[PDB]
Amino acid sequence: INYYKDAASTSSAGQSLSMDPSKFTEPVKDLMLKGAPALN
Amino acid sequence: INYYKDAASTSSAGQSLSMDPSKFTEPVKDLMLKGAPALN
Amino acid sequence: INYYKDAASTSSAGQSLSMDPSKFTEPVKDLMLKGAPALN
Amino acid sequence: TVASISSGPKHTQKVPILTANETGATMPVLPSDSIETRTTYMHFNGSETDVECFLGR
Amino acid sequence: TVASISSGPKHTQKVPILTANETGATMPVLPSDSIETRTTYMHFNGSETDVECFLGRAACVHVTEIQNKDATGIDNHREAKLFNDWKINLSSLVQLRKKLELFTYVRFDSEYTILATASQPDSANYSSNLVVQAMYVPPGAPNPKEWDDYTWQSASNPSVFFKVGDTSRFSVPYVGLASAYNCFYDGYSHDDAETQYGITVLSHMGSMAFRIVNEHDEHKTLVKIRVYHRAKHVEAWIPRAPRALPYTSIGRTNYPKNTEPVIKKRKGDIKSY
Amino acid sequence: TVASISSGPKHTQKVPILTANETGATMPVLPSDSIETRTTYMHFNGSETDVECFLGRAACVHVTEIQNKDATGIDNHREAKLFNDWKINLSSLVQLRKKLELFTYVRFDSEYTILATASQPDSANYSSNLVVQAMYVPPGAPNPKEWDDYTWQSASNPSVFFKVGDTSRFSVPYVGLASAYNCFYDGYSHDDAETQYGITVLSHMGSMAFRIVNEHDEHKTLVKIRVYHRAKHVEAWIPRAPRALPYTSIGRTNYPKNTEPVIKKRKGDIKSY
Amino acid sequence: GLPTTTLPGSGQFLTTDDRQSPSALPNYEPTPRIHIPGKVHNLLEIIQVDTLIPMNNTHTKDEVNSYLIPLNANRQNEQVFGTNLFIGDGVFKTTLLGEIVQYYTHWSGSLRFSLMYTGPALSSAKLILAYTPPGARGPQDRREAMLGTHVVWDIGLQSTIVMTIPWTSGVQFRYTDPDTYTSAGFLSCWYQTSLILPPETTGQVYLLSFISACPDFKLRLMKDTQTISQTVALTE
Amino acid sequence: GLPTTTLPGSGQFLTTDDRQSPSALPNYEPTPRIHIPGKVHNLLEIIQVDTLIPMNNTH
Amino acid sequence: GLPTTTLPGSGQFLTTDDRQSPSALPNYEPTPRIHIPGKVHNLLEIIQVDTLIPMNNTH
Amino acid sequence: GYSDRVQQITLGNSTITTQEAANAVVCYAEWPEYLPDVDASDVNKTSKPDTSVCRFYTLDSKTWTTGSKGWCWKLPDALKDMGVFGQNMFFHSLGRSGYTVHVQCNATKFHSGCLLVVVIPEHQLASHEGGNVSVKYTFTHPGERGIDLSSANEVGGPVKDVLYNMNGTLLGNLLIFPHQFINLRTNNTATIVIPYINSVPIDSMTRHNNVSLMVIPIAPLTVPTGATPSLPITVTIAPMCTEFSGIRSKSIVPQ
Numbered sequence A, B, C: 001i002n003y004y005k006d007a008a009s010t011s012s013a014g015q016s017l018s019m020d021p022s023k024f025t026e027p028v029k030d031l032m033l034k035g036a037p038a039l040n
Numbered sequence D: 001t002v003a004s005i006s007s008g009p010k011h012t013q014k015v016p017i018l019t020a021n022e023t024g025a026t027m028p029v030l031p032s033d034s035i036e037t038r039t040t041y042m043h044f045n046g047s048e049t050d051v052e053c054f055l056g057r
Numbered sequence E, F: 001t002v003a004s005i006s007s008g009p010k011h012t013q014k015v016p017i018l019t020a021n022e023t024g025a026t027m028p029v030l031p032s033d034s035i036e037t038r039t040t041y042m043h044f045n046g047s048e049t050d051v052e053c054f055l056g057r058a059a060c061v062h063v064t065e066i067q068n069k070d071a072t073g074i075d076n077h078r079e080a081k082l083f084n085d086w087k088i089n090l091s092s093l094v095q096l097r098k099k100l101e102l103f104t105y106v107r108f109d110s111e112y113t114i115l116a117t118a119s120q121p122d123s124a125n126y127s128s129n130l131v132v133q134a135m136y137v138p139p140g141a142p143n144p145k146e147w148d149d150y151t152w153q154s155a156s157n158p159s160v161f162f163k164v165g166d167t168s169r170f171s172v173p174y175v176g177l178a179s180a181y182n183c184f185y186d187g188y189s190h191d192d193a194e195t196q197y198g199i200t201v202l203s204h205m206g207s208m209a210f211r212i213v214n215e216h217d218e219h220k221t222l223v224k225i226r227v228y229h230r231a232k233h234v235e236a237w238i239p240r241a242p243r244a245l246p247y248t249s250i251g252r253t254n255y256p257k258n259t260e261p262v263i264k265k266r267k268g269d270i271k272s273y
Numbered sequence G: 001g002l003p004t005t006t007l008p009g010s011g012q013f014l015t016t017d018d019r020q021s022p023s024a025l026p027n028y029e030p031t032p033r034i035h036i037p038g039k040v041h042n043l044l045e046i047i048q049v050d051t052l053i054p055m056n057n058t059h060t061k062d063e064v065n066s067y068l069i070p071l072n073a074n075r076q077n078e079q080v081f082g083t084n085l086f087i088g089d090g091v092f093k094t095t096l097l098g099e100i101v102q103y104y105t106h107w108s109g110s111l112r113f114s115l116m117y118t119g120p121a122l123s124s125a126k127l128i129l130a131y132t133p134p135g136a137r138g139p140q141d142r143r144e145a146m147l148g149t150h151v152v153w154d155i156g157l158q159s160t161i162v163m164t165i166p167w168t169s170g171v172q173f174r175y176t177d178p179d180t181y182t183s184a185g186f187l188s189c190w191y192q193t194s195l196i197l198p199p200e201t202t203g204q205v206y207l208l209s210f211i212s213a214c215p216d217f218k219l220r221l222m223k224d225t226q227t228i229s230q231t232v233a234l235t236e
Numbered sequence H, I: 001g002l003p004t005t006t007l008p009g010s011g012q013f014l015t016t017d018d019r020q021s022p023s024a025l026p027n028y029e030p031t032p033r034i035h036i037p038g039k040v041h042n043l044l045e046i047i048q049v050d051t052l053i054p055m056n057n058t059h
Numbered sequence J: 001g002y003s004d005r006v007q008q009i010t011l012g013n014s015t016i017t018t019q020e021a022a023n024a025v026v027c028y029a030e031w032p033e034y035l036p037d038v039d040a041s042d043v044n045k046t047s048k049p050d051t052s053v054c055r056f057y058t059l060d061s062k063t064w065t066t067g068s069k070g071w072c073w074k075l076p077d078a079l080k081d082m083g084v085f086g087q088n089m090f091f092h093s094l095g096r097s098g099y100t101v102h103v104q105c106n107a108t109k110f111h112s113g114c115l116l117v118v119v120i121p122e123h124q125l126a127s128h129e130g131g132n133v134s135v136k137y138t139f140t141h142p143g144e145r146g147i148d149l150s151s152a153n154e155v156g157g158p159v160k161d162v163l164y165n166m167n168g169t170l171l172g173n174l175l176i177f178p179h180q181f182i183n184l185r186t187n188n189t190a191t192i193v194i195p196y197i198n199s200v201p202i203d204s205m206t207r208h209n210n211v212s213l214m215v216i217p218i219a220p221l222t223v224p225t226g227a228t229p230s231l232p233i234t235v236t237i238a239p240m241c242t243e244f245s246g247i248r249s250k251s252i253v254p255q
Ligand SMILES: Cc1cc(CCCCCOc2ccc(C3=NCCO3)cc2)on1
Pocket: E088, E089, E090, E091, E110, E112, E134, E135, E136, E158, E159, E160, E172, E175, E181, E182, E203, E205, E208, G024
């Protein structure tokens, strides 16, 4: 129950439960498959 | 939920969301169209 | 919502909205019509 | 609720303003019995003159 | 909502930017009438510029002070600040005043908050909790004369009792006699030759009176009252030019003589940046 | 969810453990690519590492102090701590700072808690409950000059009044001018040759000002204000390397000269355990 | 009895909170509303009405004359006036727009700047108005000025010209109190050809200038105005 | 335990507010009402009865 | 008036609790979000990127 | 061939023609109308003299010269003596009215000058004394003569400083009030229709003026060479939808 009118006044947000490290761990242009050779 | 009986005791009103500047910006008797000459 | 068991403990009563001055303003035995003569 | 109704000139045999106070009544005479009036509404209920309100603070 | 639409080159006989200001209108010209624009959206509603919002926060409207001390031998309680009052009015403190006078007539319910804090100037001991009584005294009511008169019985007059250090809060419906409160009034109370001119004649909303309920201790205690006012359910008509010169009086428009130029003089030419 | 799957002997032409790190990727290698594993489940969600959780607890962001004393003959209230202010900022205290600067841009609503406690250094008597007023003074607002200026009327500026010893709490929406707050800014406010460099130019969010509402008692009272800040509704972009050296200034990245080696030297060889 | 816990902030008074309160006057009936022309709902409604700018600020005490921008007959190539666009300060500051902007911390949007010509009907003139977006200096000559937002105004039957300063900005809000990072540009005006008076006529002619906000405009984060202060409470 | 916040005005006594209170005499039974002529409901009922004006105030 | 009882812990400030608060800036409209590459949601996302180890610590 | 430019207003037994108008303003976009019952309070039937009061009265003329500061008239005061409008005014307890205001000033295509014609609802004047000095009655009831802002301060009178609108606000912002300019080069008249604006349904016509009409030179008058250096300005005003109520003995007002 929100007792207040504005959105800033609500409690903390709830877990992204998004999670996708590939923008950080695999930003390569041509896709690399694990097990296939790195450099062909 | 109002806890009180009288109307003065309720919280602030809620946004007019009315908004019509023409009583102030265009109080002319004969309607002016933008693009048409001001004085004919 | 009454939180208490006894009737004395409830808040103020609410407007009679009864209003009938005739017991005070016209307690005459034979009915008087405005416009007709007072004493016939 | 109307506070006053519209009323115009009168030339009658029916005079609501002559009474006999000896009777003990207060006859319910209104502005419109003796002048020409226009309609107006009450806009009011008499809420704050209820005896519950009068003795209730 | 679009804030700007896309618009391209123009070579017309239809010129929206030439107008005649003598007419009194402000023609609704937009960026896209005179340059080439791209679409953009507003992303905004204008929520916080609603008059309910503009006049709806608490503003300090009055600071007064009363003291708790032995009234023994005081010939004039009112004068000893044994209790004090306030000739209700909203124009005495001038921050909120400039805001309201942007409009001619205004209608609203009031929510009052009253903060009361105590001060003990003369080196002291134990302060026993003081309870303030604020009572509303409308026009034609027995004004109180001592700090403990029959008046304070307040059997028909709303009064609130709260503790110094705390705050009291309650809300009063729009008590104006007309349909709106006049922020301005170019009239008199009657056609006399010497009667006051202004609103003060119009805005006699009675005074508010404060006192401490406690009897006196051995030391003296200064209690300073601050009244805050918040408009709720606001309705405002007829905008006016904002106040430029300083204020001199509650209820008159008068400005001080040999005031200073209110428009900042350029350091340079008309041509200067 | 499985944390590890079961995997057995391998004799392949398909080697997941040989990669080329020059590419910039971190290939997702697992225990089961190089030893024989058994199934096991995660039993865990990673709840408490969510950025909302990481930045979502109150941190002390500021400690200031004001005193209640007779202002009689004080030529500079600000200077007597008759009231004081704070040039709002979140980078002054450095525990919360290292946490935020793990990201480049951050967007969130703030919840402030303000604790105020009193101290009476000079042997004293009865302390009358002091009420603090915190008022937000945004850029381009009449800065206050005495501890009881018209400014404190605060008719349009949000202010909170609470008691010393208590706490005040309220929450302010994300007030940034852009889409996010810059944790870093490699720019200037304009292309001048001597204008400051950093964020300080970007992060001028105005100051907050505190005062005691009470007049003075016979003794003096020190009130020390602690502001706590909790981010709610957090959004963070572009992770960066954590801060290694100590901080020297609000808003610049500068580290102190002749600082000490931050990597612990081995007591022994490279070969040591 | 229901169990409760009180949180931090209990008992505080925040002048901006909005809650219910007991009415001191239970059951009172307010006066009926009657109709009054002119109701205002948003300050955004009124900042679109244009008002005069004391552009000619060069005087030494406030005078009707600082509203008048003078024009000289027969000058060529030269500059009529210049100003930066800090709407919360300087020329703009006393105008209704300037005056309202000052109740808020941030503004964004387009401005409408118009000039109404007041010279004899038998005279003629061509002026150029130029808006210079942030990043360059106030233009120093028309050549410089004409490379940015500009309108050649031809003085005619139609007496006023409405120039718009379209919102040109990286950051989506600027500060109303003048700030660098957040600065908006310059506005200048020059003779395009030149003012020419008819025979039997002489002297200076003046332009009146107005400012109002486009429907585009946004103002946010209310605060207190530097435009009004006081030293003791007023009395009756 | 449900989390609450108290507002300004807590603890005040406003002589005009209208709320519930515990009864000091739990379970007590008031005397029955009997009929009495003359009940008044509004002060507006009675100000319509006319009364004499001391017009000749000169004494 | 509804009867209440306050529990132990009333009035405490726990830096880790998560509740509602009044907004100081009623009705204010925040700047629109635009898109920015790189959003992080969990610290678990970033500790999977490898970084260099100063293994040769002997200096 | 209708132009914004030519106009005819016929009201009662009087007609005005202008061949050089600049549209007309209707305050707050509302046209004068009678008092509806739903808004009524006084129970009295009102009197609506119609055509005998709703006609055009031309006040005495003013003279714009290079030194003029501006003039100010109050309504209904300015008309307190015009024909039956005025009689009705002194004879009823309450009255109500809207007006058509037509300000006239013609010159030639060699003159320059520009007047602001503005209507200010509830124009409460300031005392030039400062403090809380009041402005006596007579001073705010100049009658058809109006107030001449270039006249000298008098005692008990209002301040007459133009950059401050006679009340502590700047001349430049008067444009927020219904107004129209007369720019010799464009315009030769200004016309404003004023609906009745008050916080009560009907009021006293003598103790309270509800609008001040103000004509202020802003771009100074500049006449052609060796022309006479001045032009007359004439103000003609017509009550419209007038209603009077509460008839009796006939008010006696100061001075
Ligand atoms: C214009 C304008 C508007 C106002 C405000 C009018 C408010 C009505 C009267 O105000 C009060 C104040 C206090 C109390 C009160 N009752 C118990 C304690 O205080 C009641 C009404 O004043 N001028």
